[PDB]
């Protein structure tokens, strides 16, 4: 019952500063090695820093003199302090315990930072009504947002099967649009309702839409 | 520097077969040295062997791990459909730890052509100046799939973005979305929306299409 729960990611302008932390439960941060990976857009797995139980620090060249990880005993809880963001950092970031100097061995769940300077922006949301022309299918079409990620659920989580949310695509104009999609029994439409629930933390936005038939 | 290359950089296996993973080093890695992690699309990576060949906790007894020296090889026994992901080597033989490049592992099965559904675009978002037609091509193997639209019998070009789920644990199928943008104007001077899906489980292309205001 290791447990290593991340917060702290998000928008953050170039040249500015962030502080990711984890919390952890079920072993004492202090008395462990403990790591930051990051893992930018589509690639591989990169160390970016590591305490030792007996405080050591080391860093990877790319950010050394601007990260700096340390430990509150008090809070068994890492953090990540950074600097001097740049879009090259843009990265989901984990922590992980490591044992000893050897091998990762649980991870967090990792939480994605945004070097950009471009400004947060909420969806607008449009349903994708069921009709004839499409077992039936509806939708929500969560259009142009900034950054990543939105969040979708159908009927507040009671609605799982047969949902896809597609991954999300960035439009010309610089904001992101995807679609979420669920196959519901055709006999359904009229009696149930159904509810995309849009999540957006970035713009501290959340918009239910209901999907009713045209 | 211990580089690690693993081999193949894609694998594509039908559940049932055996799949074997190579991660061969630069360099002799001391003491079998040697982890193996496996990342599911969206999740945090998870450690599947370390020190070469011990199975971690709670992995299942499908994977195991081999090798010895700069030759090491993580075997899948029997492939389950939750299998697909990126799995990545790591070496604790010599400073800096290093990991592979990763060997992405997909999910073969038996061909599935997709059910096809065209949404309008909304009042709602016709009030705001554009208009999102959007073809959903849903639950089929492989993913290879061609998308045309026309509109009043004219193909269009440059207009349209496609998005593609990753794999459906359950049934190792895909779903794409492709939507076509236009603006408002554009939309009402035309009558007939019409997606067209070729994909080898159709034996000829399906088109999907809807007159504008019925």
């Known amino acids: 019952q290791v447990q290593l729960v991340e917060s702290g990611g998000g928008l953050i302008q170039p040249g500015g500063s962030l502080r990711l932390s984890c919390a952890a439960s079920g072993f004492i941060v202090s008395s462990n090695y403990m790591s930051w990976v990051r893992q930018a857009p589509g690639k591989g797995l990169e160390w970016v820093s590591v305490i030792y139980s007996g405080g050591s620090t080391f860093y990877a060249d790319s950010v050394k003199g601007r990260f700096t990880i340390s430990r509150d005993n008090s809070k068994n809880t890492l953090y990540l302090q950074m600097n001097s963001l740049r879009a090259e950092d843009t990265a989901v970031y984990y922590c992980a315990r490591d044992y000893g100097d050897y091998y990762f061995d649980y991870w967090g769940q990792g939480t994605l930072v945004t070097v950009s300077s471009a400004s947060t922006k909420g969806p607008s949301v449009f349903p994708l009504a069921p009709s004839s022309k499409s077992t039936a299918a509806l939708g929500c079409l969560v259009k142009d947002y900034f950054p990543e990620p939105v969040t979708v659920s159908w009927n507040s989580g009671a609605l799982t099967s047969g949902v896809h949310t597609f991954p999300a695509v960035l439009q010309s104009s610089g904001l992101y649009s995807l679609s979420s999609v669920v196959t519901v029994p055709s006999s359904s439409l009229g009696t149930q309702t159904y509810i995309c629930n849009v999540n957006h933390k970035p713009s501290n936005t959340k918009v239910d839409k209901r999907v009713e038939p045209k | 520097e211990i580089v690690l290359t693993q081999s193949p950089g894609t694998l594509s296996l039908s559940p049932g077969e055996r799949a074997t993973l190579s991660c061969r080093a630069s360099?002799?890695?001391?003491?079998?040295?040697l982890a193996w992690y496996q990342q599911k699309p969206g999740q945090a990576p998870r450690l599947l062997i370390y020190?070469?060949?011990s199975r971690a906790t709670g992995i299942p007894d499908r994977f195991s791990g081999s090798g010895s020296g700069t030759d090491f090889t993580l075997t899948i026994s029997r492939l389950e459909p939750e299998d697909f992901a990126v799995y990545y080597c790591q070496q604790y033989g010599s400073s800096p730890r290093t990991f592979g490049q990763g060997t992405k592992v997909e999910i073969k099965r038996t061909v599935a052509a997709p059910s096809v559904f065209i949404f309008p675009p909304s009042d709602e978002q016709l009030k705001s100046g554009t208009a999102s037609v959007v073809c959903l091509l849903n639950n089929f193997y492989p993913r290879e799939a061609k998308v045309q639209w026309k509109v009043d019998n004219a193909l269009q070009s440059g207009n349209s973005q496609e998005s593609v789920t990753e794999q459906d644990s359950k049934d190792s199928t895909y779903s794409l979305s492709s939507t076509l943008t236009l603006s408002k104007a554009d939309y009402e001077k035309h009558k007939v929306y019409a997606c067209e899906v070729t994909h080898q489980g159709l034996s000829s292309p399906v088109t999907k299409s809807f007159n504008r205001g019925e």
């Open positions: 020190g070469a060949s």
């Open positions: 360099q002799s890695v001391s003491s079998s040295y």
